[PDB]
Amino acid sequence: GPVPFSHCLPTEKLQRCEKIGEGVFGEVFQTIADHTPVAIKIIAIEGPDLVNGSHQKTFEEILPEIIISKELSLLSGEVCNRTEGFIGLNSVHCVQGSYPPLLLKAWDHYNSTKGSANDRPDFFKDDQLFIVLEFEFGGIDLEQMRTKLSSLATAKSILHQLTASLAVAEASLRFEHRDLHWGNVLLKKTSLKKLHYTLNGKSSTIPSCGLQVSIIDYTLSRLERDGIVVFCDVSMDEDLFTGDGDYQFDIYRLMKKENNNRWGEYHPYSNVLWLHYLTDKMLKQMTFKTKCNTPAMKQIKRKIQEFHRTMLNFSSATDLLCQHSLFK
C-alpha cells in the first residue's frame, strides 16, 4: 500500500524543494530529481479533517486527475494527434506521514513572500495519506510573467500554442480543461524557433517567440475514451459559481450556462471561453517590454482584438485553430 514520504522525497530532494504554487487541492513544489527539475503536487486524501476549506478526496476521487494527467502527457509521443503543450507526468505515489518539516519550511517562505490562501499543512498525523504527483518542470506561470513578455507577438504565439494544444486534445480525447486561468499556463524558454504539432494526421508549426507553453492543473478537466467519461462533477458545487472581481469567475458561470450543469457531457465551447478569458488578460493586464509602436506590431494587436471580438462565435479550439483568421 502506501510508502513513507522519504521514499519519494529523500533528504536531498526535500532540501531542494521550493514551493511554487497551491490550490484548494494542496501544494506544489519545485525540486531536483536525478539532476533534473521537477514539480511535485501533493494532495491529502482519505482523512476527515477540513483542508483549505474542503473535505479531502478519497483515492477514487483523485483517479480522474491521474488518468487525465497521464493521457495529456502521452500526447507528446503520439502521431496523429501530437502535442507537447500539456505537461509530462513522471510518477504517481501514495505516501503516508505527517508533513515533512522541510516542506513546512518551504511553505512558510512562500507564505512570507507571496502570501498563501491555504492552511499551513502542519496538522496531518503520521497515518495521513497523500497522493504525490511528479511532473516535468514547465517554467513559470503566465500571471507571474505578466510584466516579463517581449511583445504582442509573444502573446500571439502563446494564444496559438494554447489553441493548438487544446485542439489536439479535443480531437484525440474530447478534452476540456475547465479551469484554464492564467496561473495554469506555464512559459519556458526554448531556442527552437518553430514548435510542431499534429492534428488529425496533419502536421503544422507555430513560431515560438522563444517560448514553449505548458497547460497544467487538470483538477476540473474532462475527457473520454471509447465512450467512458472521466470528469469532475461540480454540479452541486455552490462556491465555484459565485466568485467575482475577475472575468475568471464569470467563465465558471458561462460554462454552467453552456452545459446546463451536466458536466459529463462534452462542450468544447468551454475551451473557447477560457481562451477568450486568456486573450482578455493578454490585452488588459499584461505589460510588454516592447510596446506595439511599429506598424507590424500594431497590426498584430488589431488581429488579437479581432480575435477577442469574434472568438466566442466559434464552437471549439479545433474550430478556432482551423478557421480563425488570427492563425492564417
Ligand SMILES: O=C1NCCOCCNc2ccn3ncc(c3n2)-c2cccc1c2
Ligand atoms: O496543479 C498544478 N499546479 C497548480 C497551479 O500552480 C502552478 C505553479 N507553478 C508551476 C510551475 C512549474 N510547473 N511545472 C509543472 C507544474 C508547475 N507548476 C505543474 C504540473 C501539474 C500540475 C500543476 C503544476
Ligand code: NA
Ligand atoms: Na509542455
